[PDB]
Design an enzyme around this catalytic site. Structure first.
Site, PDB file in Angstrom:
ATOM      1  N   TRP A   1      17.642  92.981  64.273  1.00 11.87           N
ATOM      2  CA  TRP A   1      16.228  93.008  64.634  1.00 11.87           C
ATOM      3  C   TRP A   1      15.465  94.079  63.868  1.00 11.87           C
ATOM      4  O   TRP A   1      14.235  94.093  63.898  1.00 11.87           O
ATOM      5  CB  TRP A   1      16.053  93.325  66.114  1.00 11.87           C
ATOM      6  CG  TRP A   1      16.498  92.245  67.048  1.00 11.87           C
ATOM      7  CD1 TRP A   1      15.714  91.249  67.580  1.00 11.87           C
ATOM      8  CD2 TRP A   1      17.821  92.071  67.552  1.00 11.87           C
ATOM      9  NE1 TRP A   1      16.503  90.464  68.394  1.00 11.87           N
ATOM     10  CE2 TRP A   1      17.789  90.945  68.391  1.00 11.87           C
ATOM     11  CE3 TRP A   1      19.040  92.753  67.378  1.00 11.87           C
ATOM     12  CZ2 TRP A   1      18.922  90.477  69.060  1.00 11.87           C
ATOM     13  CZ3 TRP A   1      20.154  92.286  68.044  1.00 11.87           C
ATOM     14  CH2 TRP A   1      20.094  91.158  68.878  1.00 11.87           C
TER      15      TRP A   1
ATOM     16  N   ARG B   1      25.521  96.205  74.950  1.00 13.56           N
ATOM     17  CA  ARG B   1      25.510  94.821  75.402  1.00 13.56           C
ATOM     18  C   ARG B   1      26.586  94.516  76.433  1.00 13.56           C
ATOM     19  O   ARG B   1      26.322  93.759  77.375  1.00 13.56           O
ATOM     20  CB  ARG B   1      25.636  93.875  74.194  1.00 13.56           C
ATOM     21  CG  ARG B   1      25.229  92.469  74.672  1.00 13.56           C
ATOM     22  CD  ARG B   1      25.486  91.415  73.603  1.00 13.56           C
ATOM     23  NE  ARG B   1      24.646  90.241  73.883  1.00 13.56           N
ATOM     24  CZ  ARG B   1      25.059  88.979  73.824  1.00 13.56           C
ATOM     25  NH1 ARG B   1      26.311  88.644  73.520  1.00 13.56           N
ATOM     26  NH2 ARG B   1      24.206  88.007  74.091  1.00 13.56           N
TER      27      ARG B   1
ATOM     28  N   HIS C   1      25.732  92.909  79.995  1.00 14.43           N
ATOM     29  CA  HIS C   1      26.278  91.629  80.458  1.00 14.43           C
ATOM     30  C   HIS C   1      27.179  91.758  81.679  1.00 14.43           C
ATOM     31  O   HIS C   1      27.246  90.816  82.481  1.00 14.43           O
ATOM     32  CB  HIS C   1      27.094  90.907  79.370  1.00 14.43           C
ATOM     33  CG  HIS C   1      26.189  90.095  78.478  1.00 14.43           C
ATOM     34  ND1 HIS C   1      26.607  89.012  77.730  1.00 14.43           N
ATOM     35  CD2 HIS C   1      24.859  90.250  78.249  1.00 14.43           C
ATOM     36  CE1 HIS C   1      25.557  88.533  77.078  1.00 14.43           C
ATOM     37  NE2 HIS C   1      24.483  89.259  77.364  1.00 14.43           N
TER      38      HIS C   1
ATOM     39  N   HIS D   1      17.210  95.555  71.952  1.00 10.62           N
ATOM     40  CA  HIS D   1      17.441  94.768  70.756  1.00 10.62           C
ATOM     41  C   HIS D   1      17.031  95.540  69.494  1.00 10.62           C
ATOM     42  O   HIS D   1      17.263  95.034  68.394  1.00 10.62           O
ATOM     43  CB  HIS D   1      16.734  93.410  70.814  1.00 10.62           C
ATOM     44  CG  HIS D   1      17.495  92.420  71.654  1.00 10.62           C
ATOM     45  ND1 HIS D   1      16.997  91.185  72.012  1.00 10.62           N
ATOM     46  CD2 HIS D   1      18.734  92.506  72.193  1.00 10.62           C
ATOM     47  CE1 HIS D   1      17.906  90.553  72.742  1.00 10.62           C
ATOM     48  NE2 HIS D   1      18.965  91.328  72.862  1.00 10.62           N
TER      49      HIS D   1
HETATM   50  C1  HEM Z   1      16.180  87.142  77.476  1.00 14.72           C
HETATM   51  C2  HEM Z   1      17.151  88.148  77.534  1.00 14.72           C
HETATM   52  C3  HEM Z   1      18.143  88.357  76.389  1.00 14.72           C
HETATM   53  C4  HEM Z   1      18.739  87.436  75.627  1.00 14.72           C
HETATM   54  C5  HEM Z   1      18.525  85.904  75.459  1.00 14.72           C
HETATM   55  C6  HEM Z   1      19.624  88.109  74.680  1.00 14.72           C
HETATM   56  C7  HEM Z   1      20.333  87.402  73.618  1.00 14.72           C
HETATM   57  C8  HEM Z   1      21.035  88.182  72.753  1.00 14.72           C
HETATM   58  C9  HEM Z   1      21.822  87.515  71.688  1.00 14.72           C
HETATM   59  C10 HEM Z   1      21.879  85.982  71.473  1.00 14.72           C
HETATM   60  C11 HEM Z   1      22.424  88.519  71.026  1.00 14.72           C
HETATM   61  C12 HEM Z   1      23.501  88.444  69.842  1.00 14.72           C
HETATM   62  C13 HEM Z   1      24.949  88.374  70.302  1.00 14.72           C
HETATM   63  C14 HEM Z   1      25.665  88.338  68.921  1.00 14.72           C
HETATM   64  O1  HEM Z   1      25.548  87.212  68.255  1.00 14.72           O
HETATM   65  O2  HEM Z   1      26.616  89.060  68.774  1.00 14.72           O
HETATM   66  C15 HEM Z   1      22.138  89.782  71.647  1.00 14.72           C
HETATM   67  C16 HEM Z   1      22.611  90.951  71.154  1.00 14.72           C
HETATM   68  C17 HEM Z   1      22.435  92.130  71.806  1.00 14.72           C
HETATM   69  N1  HEM Z   1      21.761  92.289  72.970  1.00 14.72           N
HETATM   70 FE1  HEM Z   1      20.615  90.900  73.970  1.00 14.72          FE
HETATM   71  N2  HEM Z   1      19.533  89.430  74.958  1.00 14.72           N
HETATM   72  C18 HEM Z   1      18.702  89.685  75.990  1.00 14.72           C
HETATM   73  C19 HEM Z   1      18.564  90.844  76.716  1.00 14.72           C
HETATM   74  C20 HEM Z   1      19.165  91.997  76.359  1.00 14.72           C
HETATM   75  C21 HEM Z   1      19.056  93.282  77.122  1.00 14.72           C
HETATM   76  C22 HEM Z   1      18.424  93.234  78.542  1.00 14.72           C
HETATM   77  C23 HEM Z   1      19.814  94.243  76.569  1.00 14.72           C
HETATM   78  C24 HEM Z   1      20.187  95.603  77.170  1.00 14.72           C
HETATM   79  C25 HEM Z   1      19.395  96.397  77.824  1.00 14.72           C
HETATM   80  C26 HEM Z   1      20.463  93.532  75.375  1.00 14.72           C
HETATM   81  C27 HEM Z   1      21.268  94.218  74.402  1.00 14.72           C
HETATM   82  C28 HEM Z   1      21.748  93.597  73.319  1.00 14.72           C
HETATM   83  C29 HEM Z   1      22.447  94.367  72.353  1.00 14.72           C
HETATM   84  C30 HEM Z   1      22.496  95.908  72.257  1.00 14.72           C
HETATM   85  C31 HEM Z   1      22.869  93.512  71.407  1.00 14.72           C
HETATM   86  C32 HEM Z   1      23.575  93.704  69.958  1.00 14.72           C
HETATM   87  C33 HEM Z   1      25.092  93.557  70.172  1.00 14.72           C
HETATM   88  C34 HEM Z   1      25.820  93.783  68.827  1.00 14.72           C
HETATM   89  O3  HEM Z   1      25.246  94.150  67.898  1.00 14.72           O
HETATM   90  O4  HEM Z   1      27.054  93.510  69.022  1.00 14.72           O
HETATM   91  N3  HEM Z   1      20.023  92.248  75.340  1.00 14.72           N
HETATM   92  N4  HEM Z   1      21.321  89.510  72.691  1.00 14.72           N
END
Ligand code: HEM
Length: 293
Positions: free
Chosen positions: A190, A47, A51, A174
């Site tokens: 997820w 992530r 970002h 995700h």
């Molecule tokens: C519409 C696009 C996306 C939205 C709204 C989104 C939103 C989110 C949110 C709200 C979380 C949780 C943050 C947490 O509370 O710690 C998250 C986690 C995460 N996202 Fe996304 N995401 C999107 C696209 C992506 C993409 C493009 C990737 C990478 C290729 C990604 C990788 C991750 C990863 C790996 C995590 C887990 C982080 C952890 O466990 O600390 N996301 N995302």
């Protein structure tokens, strides 16, 4: 008019130097296994890579992975980046041992390393991002909201030059990690194998029984009785008929997902960067397991 950002190889460095940085990241991923109720740092490093790249705007080439601007407080403190400080902290001793690597190369490499060590696809990676000053830091607000629908998602990713297949492939990350209520206003993982890179996100979208519920922060999310969740933007990929076709394809073809994700992820990480005709070719790092380490 967009800025031009030309890749410039860290002086004298080659594949071997970056494999050593990869290796240090991978070894610390193994060592610090207790992080986040034993999910480990893999998901937050992916992530962080996304970002720090996802601020890019194709129209004027602002943002993007090149400048490594997450190290500046405007971007570190973006509400959309809440929780990523854990990733930055992880990378601090790596940077101290390998001070010659640029911040953008380190943040993007951390993502590549994480995906590969969690048994995901190889992600070719190019060096040469160069740190840029504080005033190049993009303003907050360029990363996506979670409470929206498929039209939002599609339009959002047009700014990163991603098409429908690229969008659906990228969202498969995700499978990794979880939402944390205190970071984002959403809570839950997820899927089951939180630190193994697979096409589980797509299988769960299609196969779980989802109910639209409110979480403890008063935000809607889709919940399954296996204890999984989907954001409104994740669930939108099965509400839109074009996205849904692609979700079904990746749910039924692990290899295809791996190849498409690898391409889109490298693209994401390289957007905005100009690579000289004579720059080195993309590096493909060996995992620890492949090295017997
Ligand atoms: C519409 C696009 C996306 C939205 C709204 C989104 C939103 C989110 C949110 C709200 C979380 C949780 C943050 C947490 O509370 O710690 C998250 C986690 C995460 N996202 Fe996304 N995401 C999107 C696209 C992506 C993409 C493009 C990737 C990478 C290729 C990604 C990788 C991750 C990863 C790996 C995590 C887990 C982080 C952890 O466990 O600390 N996301 N995302």
């Amino acid at each position: 008019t967009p800025l031009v950002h030309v890749a410039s190889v860290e002086k004298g460095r080659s594949y071997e130097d970056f494999q050593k940085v990869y290796n240090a990241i991978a070894l610390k991923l193994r060592e610090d296994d207790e992080y986040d109720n034993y999910i480990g740092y893999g998901p937050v490093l992916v992530r962080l890579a996304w970002h720090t790249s996802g601020t890019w705007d194709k129209h004027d080439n602002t943002g993007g992975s090149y400048g490594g601007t997450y190290r500046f407080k405007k971007e570190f403190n973006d509400p959309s980046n809440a929780g990523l400080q854990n990733g930055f902290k992880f990378l601090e001793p790596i940077h101290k041992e390998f001070p010659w690597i640029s911040s953008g190369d380190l943040f993007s490499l951390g993502g590549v390393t994480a995906v590969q060590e969690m048994q995901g696809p190889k992600i070719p990676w190019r060096c040469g991002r160069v740190d840029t000053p504080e005033d190049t830091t993009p303003d907050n607000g360029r990363l996506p909201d979670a409470d929206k629908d498929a039209d939002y998602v599609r339009t959002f990713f047009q700014r990163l030059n991603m098409n429908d297949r690229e969008v659906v492939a990228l969202m498969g990350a995700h499978a990794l990690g979880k939402t944390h209520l205190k970071n984002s206003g959403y809570e839950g993982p997820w899927g089951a194998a939180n630190n193994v890179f697979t096409n589980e996100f797509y299988l769960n979208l299609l196969n779980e029984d989802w109910k639209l519920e409110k979480n403890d922060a008063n935000n809607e999310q889709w919940d399954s009785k296996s204890g999984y969740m989907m954001l409104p933007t994740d669930y939108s990929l099965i509400q839109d008929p074009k996205y849904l076709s692609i979700v079904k394809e990746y749910a039924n073809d692990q290899d295809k997902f791996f190849k498409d994700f690898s391409k889109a992820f490298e693209k994401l990480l390289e957007n905005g960067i100009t690579f000289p005709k004579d720059a080195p070719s993309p590096f493909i790092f060996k995992t620890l397991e492949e090295q017997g380490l």
